[PDB]
RNA sequence: CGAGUGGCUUGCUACCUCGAUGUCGGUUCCCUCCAUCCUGCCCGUGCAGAAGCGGGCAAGGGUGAGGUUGUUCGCCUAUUAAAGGAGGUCGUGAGCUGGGUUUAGACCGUCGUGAGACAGGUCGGCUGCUAUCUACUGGGUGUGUAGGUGUCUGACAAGAACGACCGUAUAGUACGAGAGGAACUACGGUUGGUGGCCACUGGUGUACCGGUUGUUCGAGAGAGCACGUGCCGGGUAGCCACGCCACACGGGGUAAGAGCUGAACGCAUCUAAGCUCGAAACCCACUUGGAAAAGAGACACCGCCGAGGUCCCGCGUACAAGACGCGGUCGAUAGACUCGGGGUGUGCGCGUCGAGGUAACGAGACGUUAAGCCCACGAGCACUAACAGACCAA
RNA sequence: GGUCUUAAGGUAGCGUAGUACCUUGCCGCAUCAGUAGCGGCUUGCAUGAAUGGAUUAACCAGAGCUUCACUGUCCCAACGUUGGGCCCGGUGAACUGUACAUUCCAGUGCGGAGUCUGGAGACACCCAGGGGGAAGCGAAGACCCUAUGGA
RNA sequence: GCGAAAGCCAAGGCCUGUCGGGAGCAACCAACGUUAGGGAAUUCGGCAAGUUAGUCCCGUACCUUCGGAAGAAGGGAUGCC
């Protein structure tokens, strides 16, 4: 993919449960897998910020639960690496769920979201809250 | 159906023993493209510190903004070539001839070597010129040494002493390039052969970690789960089958660690200056106060602070070279907090 | 810069950057002062950041 | 229908072991095979392109994570370039696990007059040993080569030291009615593997600073104890990965293959002689080892009555013994003292306020006080200790 | 089949069960995915009435499953602590030993060789190690068959 | 302190659960502490470890043999002067 501008610390694994940053009736997600990785024997797949993985409904409402949707991880409690050598951090672990040309599901995305995230996914920026 | 991995550690850097010399000793030169020079320079590693510099690169869209870049500062005090060495071409390989010796030598050169009294040089170049003129001289390397009197904070004044190929011209040209460093002192910076922003090879003897088990050497799996407290931690499976009924030498096992000679490719050299600009507040750690004449390495150097350390331009570069980049800030920030 | 916290001038290439739930954004010098913010001390009150004295 | 190769399944035989060669499945760790799942280069097509289909060369590298089941096998989910298969006593229990099979206990179903049975199910049900030899990983001491120091060489040896994907431009271009939709090349990043390093992020830090609960030394101050820190907070050096740095291009010869000149065979023909090209594969490149290479190596210097080393002394860039490296007064090697740089977070005592209370008494706050206490780093400083002196040796 | 054997010929319930072979039965719940687990159906290879059947509050170091919470069980390993481990004094055993023995790659042999054949390799001694090999040590196999054996 | 509970301390007994010396003291093992992000992905199975935790107040479901369930669950409080 095109370059994040920054280095990740990968802060999710696969089963973990992170939330869903939009209006989509999803609540919370848990992650299946992790777009175009490929790992290592005895190793849970890593997904980090800006990331397109496959995710689950674990709670929401009763059309949206038990759904196997693709989302973007928006953001990540594991410090990420800026050029200038700061390293940021957010609050809680988000994604926001998304299409087949990577538009998002909803139309207003809830919390802050990542700087590195809008190059990449720029339909899911022209769409975004806040961007630190 | 046992799923696949690949074999844990390396198998090039074998044996895993402890180094001869605690000086490096290169294997591979570059090769010969322009102006007659020597190939390589030598310095004492002094620590780390981080430098802001603008990308330098054409092919980022980070070209010309701020980007915070770490380096390890290495105290690089002028050499002395004191001498010339000619190989002839045997069919057993290079095996070497005669050399070329000075006359004015540094107070404290014999802690290590028995110093010349009387020495002929004419007639030994002389014998350099006609393997030359009948065609079988090989390459010319020159018999350097370090000042280790220059640097304040390193305790060793007894001098290490090492070889090092000068190339670039033709075979004429580049003898006498040789014969005219020598005659003087042999006295030569980092300014002589390298040029800041240039990729170099450091080459060093790393850092000595004693004997220490699979896990750490080879960087094994630990015993997992229920397997942990059987008795069984850090010690693995199995020393091979049944059949070879003999133990592989390349089964993970335990041994040395560390002291080991490693030649880290493509460093770039970030600055050369002098003086006191990369100093940290309260001295560098385990080393001490750097005031003098120094270069800037970009990322990680192989051994420990007070080591000795080896350049060479890089015999197998990836990008272009990006010569003097825009060093705004280099920190002086203690390395106690 | 400046520290959002204690008031240190923080080093370049040196620091994290704590973002809200709610969005705002908070810069620390070092480790010391991201840990003493979330057991719930005050700058004001300690006698030892650069924001007291 | 016919001809075979294999030794992975099953079956047959009863050669080997009954004074015991420990089971299955799993695991960990190592070498291998090709009958190739992916990656490289190719041939054909019901080859427009695109995504395929089928075949050839090829074992360098890769071939992952999970749900049910003891399962091997298998069914299933989502990722992937792909999630290949097999051998090594169905690799591996003087490595592990002990879920299944296969003890003594018990239940159910079937059979049995009955004890009891079952290639039916089920619950519970143990894992010994101080390594002699050899093997390999690393570490020393002698001998040989035949006085010492420093620098090299390179017979050989090891490697995957790199593999792989994604994205950008090419280009909405070639191609195609359209839908749809590439390449050569130049770029950026990601993953797996590899080696090194710690400025930064993080971890640790029973150094250290602080708060505080019980109790004991009368209170105070200051201390012990509470598993080898009472607990809670912060945490330097160091070591670390979750942090950071680096890991080609190109050549040379081929394979399958595309061809050129070309005859036997006047033509034709890539092949018989000859030649130009062509794989991630082979050799080189690169990295590591490497004078014990018995052809037991080369150069420079120094010394053979003195070169050099050993002991000794002060210590680490070293360290399980040994080894190694530096310094030893022409000296800063270690310690003390002083700075500097750091950790903690405001000392004991006294002073003011303090809910109150007649007073005694008073938890506590402010000031004195970036205070006090502390430091595995650095600088300065010969004050202390590197003194004195032994031995070997052409 | 719409009696016959041998007396009668499975009623209440319960049911793919600790009993069901087929079997990972079919439907459903739950999960991304469930040979598991729970519910229903059930012709039950071969459930079933004191050989007791069914139901159940409470009880249980009894077997199975799911959720919340927690966590180094794992992703993936790091630092630290104490007693060892390593060096010095003292004390001071044993298991095991046909002989020789520096091995390795193949082969051969009673078909599972350090010792045979052919090659390769191999200077000697010593320290630490983890245990690949000696079909390692330990036990005249408990399995299996045999004995005109025992209980 | 509910306590013949823990922890600390007397009276009393002892330093004889009777070998020592040295190396920041390596690997490796036994007990064990703290581990960022994730949180059972480990494994036959949460095996191991962990979480909760005393006392007070509010509150407490299905079912039930009316005894119980039940400390269900859940929520708040907790020092010193
Ligand atoms: C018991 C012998 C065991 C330990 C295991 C044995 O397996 C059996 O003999 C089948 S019965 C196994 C269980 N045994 C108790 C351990 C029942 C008496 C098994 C696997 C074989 C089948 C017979 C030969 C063997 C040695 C070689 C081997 O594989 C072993 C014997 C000599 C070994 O001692
Ligand atoms: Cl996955
Ligand atoms: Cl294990
Ligand atoms: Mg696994
Ligand atoms: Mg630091
Ligand atoms: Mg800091
Ligand atoms: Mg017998
Ligand atoms: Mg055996
Ligand atoms: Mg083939
Ligand atoms: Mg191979
Ligand atoms: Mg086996
Ligand atoms: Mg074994
Ligand atoms: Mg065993
Ligand atoms: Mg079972
Ligand atoms: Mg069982
Ligand atoms: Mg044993
Ligand atoms: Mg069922
Ligand atoms: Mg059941
Ligand atoms: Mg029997
Ligand atoms: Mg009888
Ligand atoms: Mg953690
Ligand atoms: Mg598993
Ligand atoms: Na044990
Ligand atoms: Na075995
Ligand atoms: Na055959
Ligand atoms: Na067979
Ligand atoms: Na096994
Ligand atoms: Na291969
Ligand atoms: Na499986
Ligand atoms: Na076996
Ligand atoms: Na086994
Ligand atoms: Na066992
Ligand atoms: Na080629
Ligand atoms: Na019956
Ligand atoms: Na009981
Ligand atoms: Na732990
Ligand atoms: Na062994
Ligand atoms: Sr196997
Ligand atoms: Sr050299
Ligand atoms: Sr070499
Ligand atoms: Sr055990
Ligand atoms: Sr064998
Ligand atoms: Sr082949
Ligand atoms: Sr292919
Ligand atoms: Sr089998
Ligand atoms: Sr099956
Ligand atoms: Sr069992
Ligand atoms: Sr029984
Ligand atoms: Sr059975
Ligand atoms: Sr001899
Ligand atoms: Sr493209
Ligand atoms: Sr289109
Ligand atoms: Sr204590
Ligand atoms: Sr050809
Ligand atoms: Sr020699
Ligand atoms: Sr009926
Ligand atoms: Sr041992
Ligand atoms: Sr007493
Ligand atoms: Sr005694
Ligand atoms: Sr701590
Ligand atoms: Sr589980
Ligand atoms: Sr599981
Ligand atoms: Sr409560």
Same mark, same amino acid.
């Given at each position: 993919?095109?370059?994040?501008?920054?280095?990740?610390?990968?802060g999710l694994?696969?089963?973990s449960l992170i939330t869903?940053?939009?209006?989509?009736?999803?609540?919370?997600?848990?992650?299946?897998?992790?777009?175009?990785?490929?790992?290592?024997?005895?190793?849970?797949?890593?997904?980090?910020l800006?990331?397109?993985?496959?995710?689950?409904?674990?709670?929401?409402?009763?059309?949206?639960?038990?759904?196997?949707?693709?989302?973007?991880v928006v953001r990540q409690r594991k410090?990420?690496?800026?050029?200038?050598?700061?390293?940021?951090?957010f609050e809680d672990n988000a994604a926001?769920?998304?299409?087949?040309?990577?538009?998002?599901?909803?139309?207003?995305?809830?919390?802050?979201?990542?700087?590195?995230?809008?190059?990449?996914?720029?339909?899911?920026?022209?769409?975004?809250?806040?961007?630190? | 159906?046992?799923?696949?991995?690949?074999?844990?550690?390396?198998?090039?850097?074998?044996?895993?023993?402890?180094?001869?010399?605690?000086?490096?000793?290169?294997?591979? /030169?570059?090769?010969?493209?322009?102006?007659?020079?020597?190939? &390589?320079?030598? &310095? !004492?590693?002094?620590?780390?510190?981080?430098?802001?510099?603008?990308?330098?690169?054409?092919?980022?869209?980070?070209?010309?903004?701020?980007?915070?870049?770490?380096?390890?500062?290495?105290?690089?005090?002028?050499?002395?070539?004191?001498?010339?060495?000619?190989?002839?071409?045997?069919?057993?390989?290079?095996?070497?001839?005669?050399?070329?010796?000075?006359? %004015?030598?540094?107070?404290?050169?014999?802690?290590?070597?028995?110093?010349?009294?009387?020495?002929? #040089?004419?007639?030994?170049?002389?014998?350099?010129?006609?393997?030359?003129?009948?065609?079988?001289?090989?390459?010319?390397?020159?018999?350097?040494?370090?000042?280790?009197?220059?640097?304040?904070?390193?305790?060793? @004044?007894?001098?290490?002493?090492?070889?090092?190929?000068?190339?670039?011209?033709?075979?004429?040209?580049?003898?006498?390039?040789?014969?005219?460093?020598?005659?003087?002192?042999?006295?030569?910076?980092?300014?002589?052969?390298?040029?800041?922003?240039? !990729?170099?090879?450091?080459?060093?003897?790393?850092?000595? @970690?004693?004997?220490?088990?699979?896990?750490?050497? /080879?960087?094994?799996? @630990?015993?997992?789960?229920?397997?942990?407290?059987?008795? /069984?931690?850090?010690?693995?499976?199995?020393?091979?089958?049944?059949? #070879?009924?003999?133990?592989?030498?390349?089964?993970?096992?335990?041994?040395?660690?560390?002291?080991?000679?490693?030649?880290?490719?493509?460093?770039?050299?970030?600055?050369?200056?002098?003086?006191?600009?990369?100093?940290?507040? &309260? &001295?560098?750690?385990?080393?001490?106060?750097?005031?003098?004449? !120094?270069?800037?390495?970009?990322?990680?150097?192989?051994?420990?602070?007070?080591?000795?350390?080896?350049?060479?331009?890089?015999?197998?570069?990836?990008?272009?070279?990006?010569?003097?980049? %825009?060093?705004?800030?280099?920190?002086?920030?203690?390395?106690?907090? | 810069?400046?520290?959002?916290?204690?008031?240190?001038?923080?080093?370049?290439?040196?620091?994290?950057?704590?973002? $809200?739930?709610?969005?705002?954004?908070? $810069?620390?010098?070092?480790?010391?002062?991201?840990?003493?913010?979330?057991?719930?001390?005050?700058?004001?009150?300690?006698?030892?950041?650069?924001?007291?004295?």
């Open positions: 993919m095109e370059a994040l501008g920054a280095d990740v610390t990968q694994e696969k089963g869903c940053a939009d209006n989509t009736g999803a609540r919370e997600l848990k992650v299946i897998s992790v777009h175009g990785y490929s790992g290592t024997k005895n190793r849970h797949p890593k997904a980090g800006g990331d397109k993985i496959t995710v689950s409904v674990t709670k929401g409402t009763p059309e949206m639960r038990r759904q196997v949707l693709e989302a973007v410090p990420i690496r800026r050029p200038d050598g700061t390293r940021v951090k926001v769920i998304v299409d087949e040309n990577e538009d998002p599901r909803g139309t207003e995305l809830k919390g802050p979201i990542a700087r590195e995230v809008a190059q990449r996914f720029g339909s899911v920026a022209s769409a975004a809250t806040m961007i630190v | 159906p046992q799923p696949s991995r690949p074999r844990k550690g390396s198998l090039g850097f074998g044996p895993r023993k402890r180094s001869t010399s605690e000086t490096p000793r290169f294997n591979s /030169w570059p090769s010969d493209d322009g102006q007659p020079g020597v190939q &390589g320079f030598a &310095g !004492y590693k002094a620590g780390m510190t981080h430098v802001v510099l603008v990308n330098d690169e054409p092919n980022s869209p980070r070209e010309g903004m701020e980007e915070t870049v770490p380096v390890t500062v290495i105290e690089t005090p002028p050499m002395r070539a004191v001498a010339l060495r000619a190989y002839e071409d045997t069919p057993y390989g290079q095996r070497p001839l005669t050399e070329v010796w000075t006359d %004015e030598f540094h107070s404290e050169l014999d802690r290590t070597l028995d110093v010349p009294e009387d020495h002929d #040089p004419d007639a030994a170049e002389e014998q350099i010129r006609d393997a030359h003129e009948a065609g079988d001289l090989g390459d010319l390397r020159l018999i350097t040494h370090t000042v280790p009197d220059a640097v304040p904070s390193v305790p060793k @004044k007894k001098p290490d002493v090492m070889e090092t190929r000068v190339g670039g011209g033709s075979v004429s040209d580049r003898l006498d390039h040789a014969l005219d460093i020598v005659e003087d002192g042999g006295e030569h910076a980092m300014n002589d052969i390298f040029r800041a922003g240039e !990729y170099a090879d450091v080459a060093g003897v790393t850092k000595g @970690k004693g004997t220490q088990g699979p896990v750490k050497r /080879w960087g094994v799996q @630990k015993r997992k789960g229920k397997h942990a407290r059987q008795g /069984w931690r850090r010690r693995i499976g199995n020393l091979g089958p049944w059949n #070879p009924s003999r133990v592989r030498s390349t089964v993970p096992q335990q041994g040395q660690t560390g002291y080991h000679q490693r030649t880290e490719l493509n460093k770039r050299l970030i600055d050369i200056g002098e003086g006191d600009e990369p100093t940290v507040d &309260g &001295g560098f750690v385990n080393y001490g106060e750097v005031d003098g004449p !120094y270069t800037l390495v970009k990322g990680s150097v192989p051994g420990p602070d007070k080591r000795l350390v080896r350049f060479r331009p890089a015999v197998r570069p990836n990008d272009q070279p990006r010569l003097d980049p %825009e060093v705004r800030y280099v920190s002086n920030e203690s390395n106690q907090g | 810069r400046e520290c959002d916290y204690c008031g240190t001038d923080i080093e370049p290439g040196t620091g994290t950057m704590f973002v $809200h739930k709610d969005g705002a954004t908070t $810069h620390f010098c070092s480790s010391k002062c991201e840990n003493n913010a979330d057991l719930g001390r005050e700058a004001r009150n300690l006698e030892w950041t650069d924001t007291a004295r």
